[PDB]
């Protein structure tokens, strides 16, 4: 039960399912002490069952319990666990993550196969903690807390801060993903090349594995944090180290479109 922005309250449906149960239990205790006839106790007891039923799996047996003046079935414990939106397939086998971003992709013919164009403004957020530490070593700010204060306002960013970021990302890779991720190459690792501009630059040869075109596709960026994650990316996931289809064994990164045409 939380207060939202407006001072309004927002509450989980389980509270209403519990309230129904609690009322009926308490009423049952009262009806028993007052020695109600068997017809009345029977109605109360059967109502208690239905209340337990709605709490555990609502709609399973009988009419789904609804909030008043809405057709929406209340969301019971079973609904929380199960389904596409359930606890398992939503919060357990997949999650939203930190250190990630997304933008429109653009072709970057000049890139080497292991590279991508990464907007500098994206990289500053994605690497923000790394940038704060480095900003203290070269002194651009007295300490970590003050350095963060400088990035809050966009006009307060000086030009030495961009050079600071270049030092940070040295040799590190990022992950690019384009959904749907149909096979393991929907994610590949790239060494980012910082660019002005708001677009991600993608190497032409990897477009086939991603099934990416430039008709407006977007891709997601992720930053592997640990030395272990970074190693995994550079060795196992780097685009240049995966050149052949794991399915057929045939070359995946191969000439296409203009490249074939020219040759």
């Amino acid at each position: 039960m939380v207060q939202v922005d407006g001072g309004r309250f927002a509450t989980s449906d389980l509270n209403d399912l519990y309230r129904r149960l609690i009322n009926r239990n308490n009423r049952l205790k009262k009806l028993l002490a007052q020695g109600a006839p068997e017809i009345i106790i029977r109605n109360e007891k059967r109502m208690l069952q239905e209340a337990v039923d709605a709490l555990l799996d609502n709609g399973r047996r009988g009419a789904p319990v609804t909030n008043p003046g809405s057709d929406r079935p209340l969301r019971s414990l079973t609904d929380i666990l199960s389904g596409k939106q359930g606890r398992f397939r939503q919060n357990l086998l997949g999650k939203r993550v930190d250190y990630s971003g997304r933008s429109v992709i653009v072709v970057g013919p000049q890139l080497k196969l292991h590279q991508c164009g990464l907007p500098k403004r994206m990289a500053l957020e994605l690497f923000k903690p790394f940038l704060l530490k480095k900003m203290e070593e070269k002194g651009i700010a007295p300490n970590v807390k003050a350095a963060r204060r400088m990035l809050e306002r966009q006009r307060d960013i000086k030009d030495e801060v961009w050079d600071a970021l270049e030092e940070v990302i040295h040799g590190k890779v990022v992950l690019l993903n384009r959904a749907p991720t149909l096979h393991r190459l929907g994610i590949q690792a790239f060494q980012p090349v910082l660019v002005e501009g708001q677009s991600i630059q993608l190497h032409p040869l990897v477009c086939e594995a991603f099934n990416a075109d430039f008709d407006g596709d977007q891709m997601a960026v992720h930053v592997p944090l640990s030395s272990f994650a970074q190693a995994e990316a550079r060795i196992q996931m780097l685009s240049a180290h995966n050149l052949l289809s794991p399915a057929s064994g045939e070359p995946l990164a191969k000439p296409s479109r203009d490249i074939i045409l020219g040759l």
Partner: peptide, 8 residues
């Protein structure tokens, strides 16, 4: 099968 109808 209908709790109201049963009670009635």
């Amino acid at each position: 099968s209908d709790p109201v109808r049963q009670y009635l």
